[PDB]
């Protein structure tokens, strides 16, 4: 394969005042959620049979411990500074940390942060870098981390650049039968919202396919109809995908139109559905 894969942990913290806050963290392999966080017991929730990713229970309990210390220290500092400057409440922090594996095996680390939905800072190579927007707060936090916080930055560098790629690849190998499976889509047709008097909206639904690459078109014979509109490839429960293809046509020109579906699981034999509509008595 030539494709980039990535792993991320994401956090969302809301601080309403100095005595009340709440948070949420999770782990994601590409767009697939593979981990949660139980906040009462401070432990990792493994969503799949392969979610330990060939890590030993020892490294994992040590990561849980590390995350617990990190959460404690993070909230304690933010509250020390925001209680004095209490005009900031209520506010929301977004964190996204993790790594990407490029096609030749080169790892790339990531640690981005946002404040009320705006880029606040990031971690470029070895330096905490503020964003152009805001500065100040960004510059403050960045100086704080650059010069006033010990092996914290060292540990973050080691975590996003060595521990993360190793866990990514261990996850992929631990679930290879899930990772490399093929799942056949099923398709069906429906009408859509009326585009206007004397006009029809044809919809082709394609659902349950994995992996994500798919080809779906409205056709007349071998003429692909240029008007086909593809929707977002939406996620299903249990790792499959869903897709709508719609087409607007005058009634009287709808006969002969068909939906065609091409997917890796189909062994060359495409799915074809002819629009019937009100044509058949």
């Amino acid at each position: 394969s030539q494709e980039h894969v990535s792993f991320h942990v994401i956090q969302i913290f809301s601080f309403v005042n100095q005595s009340w806050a709440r948070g949420q963290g999770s782990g994601w392999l590409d767009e697939l959620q593979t981990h949660g966080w139980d906040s009462e017991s401070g432990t990792i929730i493994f969503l799949h049979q392969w979610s330990k990713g060939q890590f030993s229970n020892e490294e994992l309990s040590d990561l849980e411990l590390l995350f617990r210390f990190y959460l404690f220290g993070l909230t304690r500092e933010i509250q020390d500074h925001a209680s004095q400057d209490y005009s900031k409440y209520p506010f929301e922090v977004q964190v996204k940390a993790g790594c990407e594996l490029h096609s030749g095996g080169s790892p790339e680390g990531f640690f981005q942060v946002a404040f009320n939905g705006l880029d606040l800072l990031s971690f470029q190579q070895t330096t905490w870098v503020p964003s152009p927007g805001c500065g100040s707060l960004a510059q403050s936090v960045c100086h704080l981390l650059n010069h006033q916080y010990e092996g914290v930055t060292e540990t973050v560098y080691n975590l996003i650049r060595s521990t993360c790629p190793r866990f990514l690849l261990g996850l992929l190998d631990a679930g290879k039968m899930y990772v490399h499976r093929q799942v056949r889509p099923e398709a069906w047709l429906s009408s859509g919202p009326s585009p206007g008097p004397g006009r029809l909206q044809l919809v082709c639904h394609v659902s349950g396919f994995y992996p994500k690459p798919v080809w779906v078109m409205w056709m007349r014979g071998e003429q692909e109809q240029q008007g086909t509109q593809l929707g977002d490839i939406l996620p299903n429960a249990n790792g499959t995908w869903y897709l709508r293809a719609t087409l607007d046509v005058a009634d009287g020109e709808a006969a002969g139109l068909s939906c065609r579906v091409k997917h890796s699981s189909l062994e060359g034999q495409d799915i074809i559905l002819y629009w019937r509509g009100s044509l058949v008595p």
């Binding site: 929301e92 939905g117 639904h205 659902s207 996620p235 299903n236 429960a237």
Partner: protein, 98 residues
């Protein structure tokens, strides 16, 4: 950051087959801030047996959630997804049709 209203997309795993197990999905994305009320409705009543993803956000930092529930449709019963946000004066609804 300018508040963003949720996009709500409702869709089933399988073709509607009256008297057949099926999954109803509701994808809610592009909203900010993160506080939100999503419910799946059967005949205007909130379904409790539901599953949802943990909160996640795109690269523009707007949030998104997948909701789903297993169900069996009939001509009598209609299903919906209801969302309430700060950017919403009245709880917005999206209805599911065969």
């Amino acid at each position: 950051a300018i508040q963003r209203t949720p996009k709500i997309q409702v869709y089933s795993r399988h073709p509607a087959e009256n008297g057949k197990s099926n999954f109803l999905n509701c994808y809610v994305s592009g909203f900010h801030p993160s506080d939100i009320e999503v419910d799946l409705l059967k005949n205007g009543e909130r379904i409790e047996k539901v599953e949802h993803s943990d909160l996640s956000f795109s690269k523009d930092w707007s949030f998104y959630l997948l909701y789903y529930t297993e169900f069996t449709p009939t001509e009598k019963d209609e299903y919906a997804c209801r969302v309430n946000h700060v950017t919403l004066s009245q709880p917005k609804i999206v209805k599911w049709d065969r």
